[PDB]
DNA sequence: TGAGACGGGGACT
DNA sequence: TAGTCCCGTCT
């Protein structure tokens, strides 16, 4: 079992927690496009599709970044049938710059499955949503099911994890499988049976605007009377959920002692050489060369200027890049390769350093443009399915140009 | 099982 | 400044 200092053994505490959080939400909730669409869309499938898209985009992405992407998505594909007919290229174009591009592909595949195999009907429970929809894990299933279908299911995102680890003073490593089970148990216990969707959004919004990672706003916290972390700074525990013997306590960290942060290792340094090959084209030039990454691994299926991966001691070499550029353009006068500078793009796991080069041709390449290579205008590149790193490479190529 | 793969940026000091 | 933390799913 566990201690009651770590659970809500008093139903009055749960009832007060629901009413306090919901009351704060009822007078402070942020105006969001997917919240308006949900409360007015009477059709369950349409309503679930709007919630589905928002919850996928919100994965590891802040609300402020999602709002513009969600609006563009719903404008282009207002219905599941519209998304089901879209190409993966189009999805990658709209997802450009949002990050974690597998979310877009699976969102399109899932809608394609709903329309083509389920008659356009969304599963109505978190269990079946998670079972049938790719890219819909445990959070997104409970998110869709509670918000769109009123199923009484609690969810745990990063915000709820931070709120719960503080309210019940959980100081263990939150990523371990046992505290993860206890957090989802607390969420399923606390979720309001009458308003499960509004409860989950209230909990998540509380962790984004009040119970923030740094400098929380307890002077404005509605659940400050049910938080064990807050009362300590002003009932003690009897373990596996408190702070370990090696886990240090800090008087100057306040309630932010919880949750215990996991010191991440800095990303591995990788090095690459990329070049923006240009030709004058006709009207609307110049045209720049884009090639498509493999449909696996990092930035799968996106378009990029021709690049080569180099070991650190070779990061300034040209021979591998020239060999790559001659694949798509044929023979190339090599002394025209101009070094423009470097671009450092940070992934969650890779620190990539691009040595950016530029190559301006006088006319069209003598060899025919092989398949897999496209020559785009500048406007077409800015709307293409490319990663932000390549947009950084282009804007540098645009600066060092006359 | 679980620990790394998988993007980009917003908001703190 | 230039860091530092942090906003799920899958294999
Ligand atoms: S009292 Fe402080 S630590 Fe507790 S939930 Fe509210 S903001 Fe978070
Ligand atoms: Zn304990």
């Amino acid at each position: 079992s566990v201690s009651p200092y770590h659970l809500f053994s008093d139903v009055a505490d749960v009832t007060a927690f629901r009413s306090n959080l919901l009351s704060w939400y009822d007078q402070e909730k942020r105006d969001l496009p997917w919240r308006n669409l949900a409360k007015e869309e009477a059709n369950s499938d349409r309503r679930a599709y709007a919630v589905w898209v928002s919850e996928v985009m919100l994965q590891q992405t802040q609300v402020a970044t999602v709002i513009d992407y969600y609006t563009r998505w719903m404008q282009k594909w207002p219905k599941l049938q519209d998304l089901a007919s879209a190409s993966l290229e189009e999805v990658n174009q709209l997802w450009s710059g949002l990050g974690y591009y597998s979310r877009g592909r699976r969102l399109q595949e899932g809608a394609r499955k709903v329309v083509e195999e389920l008659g356009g009907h969304m599963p109505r429970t978190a269990e079946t949503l998670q079972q049938l929809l790719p890219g819909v894990g445990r959070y997104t299933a409970g998110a869709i099911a509670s918000i769109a279908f009123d199923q009484v299911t609690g969810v745990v995102d990063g915000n709820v994890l931070r709120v719960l680890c503080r309210v019940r003073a959980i100081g263990a490593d939150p990523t371990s499988t046992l505290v993860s089970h206890h957090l989802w148990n607390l969420a399923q216990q606390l979720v309001d049976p009458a308003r499960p969707g509004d409860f989950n959004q209230a909990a998540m919004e509380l962790g984004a605007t009040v119970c923030t990672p740094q400098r929380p706003l307890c002077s404005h916290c509605p659940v400050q009377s049910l938080c064990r972390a807050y009362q300590r700074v002003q009932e003690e525990c009897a373990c596996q959920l408190c702070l370990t013997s090696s886990s240090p306590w800090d008087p100057s960290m306040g309630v932010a002692n919880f949750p215990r942060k996991a010191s991440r290792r800095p990303p591995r340094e990788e090095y690459s050489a990329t070049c923006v090959v240009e030709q004058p084209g006709a009207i609307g030039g110049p045209l720049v060369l884009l090639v498509q990454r493999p449909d696996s691994g990092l930035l799968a299926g996106l378009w990029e200027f021709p690049s080569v991966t180099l070991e650190p001691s070779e990061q300034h070499q040209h021979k591998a890049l020239l060999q790559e550029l001659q694949r798509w353009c044929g023979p190339l006068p090599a002394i025209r390769l101009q070094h423009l500078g470097e671009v450092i793009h940070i992934f969650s796991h890779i620190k990539l350093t691009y040595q950016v080069y530029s190559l301006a041709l006088d006319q069209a390449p003598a060899s025919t443009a092989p398949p897999g290579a496209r020559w785009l205008t500048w406007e077409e590149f800015c709307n293409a399915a490319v990663s932000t790193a390549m947009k950084k490479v282009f804007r540098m190529y645009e600066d060092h140009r006359q």
Side-chain angles (χ1 to χ4, degrees):
Chain A
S1 319
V2 188
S3 126
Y5 170 90
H6 277 338
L7 279 81
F8 288 83
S9 309
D10 195 1
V11 179
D13 289 350
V14 178
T15 304
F17 193 93
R18 299 170 175 167
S19 64
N20 294 345
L21 183 60
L22 281 170
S23 182
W24 166 85
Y25 183 73
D26 286 325
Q27 59 189 102
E28 301 295 334
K29 55 177 181 179
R30 180 176 182 173
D31 186 69
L32 296 176
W34 48 86
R35 283 176 181 171
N36 310 134
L37 297 180
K39 105 157 192 181
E40 308 170 9
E41 179 56 63
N43 185 255
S44 301
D45 296 318
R46 292 163 162 254
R47 182 171 66 256
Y49 167 66
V51 174
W52 182 9
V53 172
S54 73
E55 297 298 332
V56 167
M57 293 189 172
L58 283 173
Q59 298 172 4
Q60 301 290 272
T61 311
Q62 292 187 172
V63 174
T65 311
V66 173
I67 294 175
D68 285 353
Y69 279 94
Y70 179 86
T71 292
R72 272 182 266 116
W73 186 284
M74 301 304 303
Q75 286 267 177
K76 190 173 195 63
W77 305 300
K79 302 171 62 181
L80 287 149
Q81 290 72 9
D82 305 320
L83 179 54
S85 304
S87 73
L88 175 56
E89 177 91 355
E90 292 177 318
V91 172
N92 288 344
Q93 289 177 274
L94 208 141
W95 213 265
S96 187
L98 193 50
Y100 286 171
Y101 295 85
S102 293
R103 294 183 288 159
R105 174 182 53 83
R106 290 165 186 157
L107 184 52
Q108 195 281 330
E109 293 175 355
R112 184 174 279 159
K113 181 175 179 175
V114 168
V115 176
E116 293 178 0
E117 306 199 65
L118 302 175
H121 297 293
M122 295 278 295
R124 304 300 171 86
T125 61
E127 191 183 62
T128 54
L129 284 158
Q130 183 175 359
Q131 173 186 20
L132 299 165
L133 300 192
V136 172
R138 189 177 179 184
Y139 167 75
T140 307
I144 296 170
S146 59
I147 300 173
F149 303 136
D150 230 15
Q151 186 185 357
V152 188
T153 310
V155 290
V156 174
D157 72 322
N159 293 288
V160 174
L161 174 141
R162 176 171 54 259
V163 174
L164 288 185
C165 282
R166 295 175 175 176
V167 167
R168 289 290 81 131
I170 293 177
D173 167 271
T175 68
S176 69
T177 176
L178 183 56
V179 63
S180 174
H181 182 75
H182 184 240
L183 289 181
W184 283 87
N185 274 259
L186 282 172
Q188 192 65 27
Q189 174 189 17
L190 293 169
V191 61
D192 188 74
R195 310 171 60 190
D198 292 356
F199 178 92
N200 295 326
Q201 296 198 77
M204 292 181 282
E205 186 150 315
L206 187 77
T209 64
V210 174
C211 201
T212 46
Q214 295 99 26
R215 304 245 297 169
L217 313 183
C218 308
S219 126
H220 284 62
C221 178
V223 294
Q224 130 189 170
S225 67
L226 302 158
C227 195
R228 305 283 196 206
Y230 182 86
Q231 297 178 336
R232 196 194 196 105
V233 199
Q234 303 300 99
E235 189 54 85
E236 193 75 307
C237 187
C239 189
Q240 62 196 182
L241 299 186
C242 288
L243 286 127
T244 327
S245 302
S246 301
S247 299
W249 169 265
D250 196 330
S252 54
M253 283 208 299
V255 303
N257 279 277
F258 322 95
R260 185 179 108 81
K261 64 189 310 302
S263 182
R264 69 195 75 261
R265 191 69 58 248
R268 64 179 197 269
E269 290 184 354
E270 296 195 4
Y271 296 88
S272 179
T274 178
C275 177
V276 177
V277 186
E278 110 171 20
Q279 67 176 281
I283 311 299
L287 307 182
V288 296
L289 173 59
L290 278 301
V291 296
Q292 182 172 36
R293 305 177 52 85
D295 70 317
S296 65
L298 192 67
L299 300 172
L302 296 192
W303 294 84
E304 69 177 23
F305 308 108
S307 307
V308 290
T309 47
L310 304 173
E311 290 290 339
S313 68
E314 313 161 355
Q315 63 182 285
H316 291 101
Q317 284 192 6
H318 302 356
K319 191 161 305 306
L321 178 61
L322 291 177
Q323 278 272 315
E324 173 73 11
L325 296 179
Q326 294 215 9
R327 295 180 50 195
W328 313 101
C329 307
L332 295 172
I335 77 172
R336 325 174 73 182
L337 187 66
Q338 178 186 14
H339 185 264
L340 302 189
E342 68 178 14
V343 163
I344 293 180
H345 193 64
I346 308 297
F347 300 89
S348 288
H349 59 306
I350 295 170
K351 177 178 179 179
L352 185 54
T353 296
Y354 278 113
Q355 287 303 324
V356 176
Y357 297 87
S358 189
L359 184 61
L361 301 179
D362 297 321
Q363 73 282 45
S367 66
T368 62
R374 308 192 310 190
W375 293 90
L376 317 177
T377 68
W378 290 4
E379 293 76 16
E380 288 168 358
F381 166 85
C382 289
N383 297 262
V386 302
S387 65
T388 303
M390 290 301 151
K391 285 167 175 169
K392 295 178 177 184
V393 176
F394 172 82
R395 302 289 171 171
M396 168 173 293
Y397 146 83
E398 192 176 4
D399 290 315
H400 291 111
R401 197 183 183 279
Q402 67 292 341

